[PDB]
Design a protein around this ligand. Structure first.
Ligand SMILES: O=C(O)C[C@@H](Cc1ccccc1)[C@H](O)SCc1ccccc1
Ligand SMILES: [Zn+2]
Length: 171
C-alpha cells in the first residue's frame, strides 16, 4: 500500500506532468494505486495523492469493486453550464465531506494502460469523480471550493485524524 498525502501537505499543490510512455513502471504504479484505493477504501485516486506527480488517475465507481478504470493524460471538457451538487470526499482530506457544484456532463479524452486513446461522455458520478481527480493533477483540492472557515475546520480535523492514525500504529 502506497502512503496517501494528507491536506495541508504542500506536495498536493504540485501540477502533474503528462506521462510520456505507458511503461511497465506506470503499469505497476497503477496496480499499487488500485490496491491503496480499494484498501482505503475509495472510488478514485490521483497519482499526485501518492506523491507521484504524473497525469495518472485510477477509479472504480462499483459496489463490487470490479469495474476498474484508468485515465492517463486526461482532458476533461464540460458539455453544459448546468451543474449538479454532490457531497464529495477525498482520501487526501480523510473523513471530510461537503457539497461541491460541478458541470453535470463532460467529455473525457485519455489513454488507457495499453497506450490506446479513448473518448467518452460522462454524467452523474463519473462526471463528478473525473473532475475531482483532474483537479488533483492541477494541484487543487475539493476544500478550495469551500468557505475559508470550512477549510480551516477541515485542516484542524484532518490533523487530529492523522495524529490518531499514527497513535493506532504505536498501540
Ligand atoms: O481520494 C480521492 O481523490 C478519491 C475520492 C473521490 C471522490 C469523488 C467524488 C465524491 C467522493 C469521493 C474518494 O473516492 S472518497 C472515499 C469514498 C469511499 C466510498 C464511497 C464514497 C467515497
Ligand atoms: Zn481527492
Amino acid at each position: 500500500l502506497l502512503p496517501i498525502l494528507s491536506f495541508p501537505d504542500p506536495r498536493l499543490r504540485t501540477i502533474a506532468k503528462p506521462v510520456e510512455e505507458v511503461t511497465d513502471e506506470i503499469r505497476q504504479l497503477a496496480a499499487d494505486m488500485f490496491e491503496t484505493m480499494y484498501a482505503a477504501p475509495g472510488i478514485g485516486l490521483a497519482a499526485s495523492q501518492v506523491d507521484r506527480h504524473i497525469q495518472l488517475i485510477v477509479m472504480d465507481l462499483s459496489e463490487s469493486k470490479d469495474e476498474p478504470m484508468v485515465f492517463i493524460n486526461p482532458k476533461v471538457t464540460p458539455l453544459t453550464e448546468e451543474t449538479q451538487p454532490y457531497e464529495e470526499g477525498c482520501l487526501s482530506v480523510p473523513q471530510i465531506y461537503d457539497k461541491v457544484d460541478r458541470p453535470s456532463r463532460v467529455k473525457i479524452e485519455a489513454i488507457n494502460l495499453e497506450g490506446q486513446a479513448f473518448e467518452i461522455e460522462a454524467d452523474g458520478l463519473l462526471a463528478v469523480c473525473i473532475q475531482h481527480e483532474m483537479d488533483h493533477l492541477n494541484g487543487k483540492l475539493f476544500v478550495d471550493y469551500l468557505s475559508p472557515l470550512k477549510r480551516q475546520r477541515a485542516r484542524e480535523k484532518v490533523e487530529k485524524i492523522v495524529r490518531q492514525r499514527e497513535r493506532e500504529k504505536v498501540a
